């Protein structure tokens, strides 16, 4: 089910080697760069009605 999951931002800068990302996120780096951003994997649940009252 790899096609069910998307990578999204976890809204934080990070550097490799330092445990800087929140749990459940990863530090995504481009190539040999030491600095990157925190990301996370999510799956969307579809089918929600257009309006929900709580």
Numbering used by the authors: 13 to 66
From the paper:
EVA3 was expressed and purified from Escherichia coli and crystallized readily. The crystal structure of the nonglycosylated EVA3 contains two molecules per asymmetric unit, monomer A (Gly13–Arg66) and monomer B (Asp12–Asn56). The two monomers are very similar, and the Cα of residues 13–56 can be overlaid with a root-mean-square deviation of 1.0 Å. Residues Leu57 to the C-terminal Arg66 are not visible in monomer B and are only visible in monomer A because of an extensive β-sheet interaction of this region of the protein with a symmetry-related monomer. The EVA3 monomer is composed essentially of a single domain containing a large antiparallel β-sheet composed of residues Phe17–Thr27 (β1) and residues Lys47–Gly55 (β3), with residues Phe38–Gly40 forming a third short additional strand (β2) interacting with residues His49–Tyr51 of β3. Two extensive loop regions, composed of residues Ser28–Cys37 and Leu41–Lys47 join the two major β-strands, whereas a very short α-helix is present at the N-terminal region residues Ala14–Asn16. The short β2 strand, which interacts with β3, is held in place by a disulfide bridge between residues Cys26 and Cys39. The first loop, between strands β1 and β2, is rigidified by the presence of two other disulfide bridges between Cys33 and Cys50 and Cys37 and Cys22. The topology of EVA3 is that of an archetypal knottin cystine knot, with the Cys3–Cys6 disulfide bond (Cys33–Cys50 in EVA3) traversing the macrocycle created by Cys1–Cys4 (Cys22–Cys37 in EVA3) and Cys2–Cys5 (Cys26–Cys39 in EVA3) disulfide bonds. The crystal structure also contains a cadmium ion present in the crystallization solution that binds to the side-chain oxygen atoms of Glu60, carbonyl oxygen of Leu57, and carbonyl of Gly36 of the symmetry-related chain A molecule.
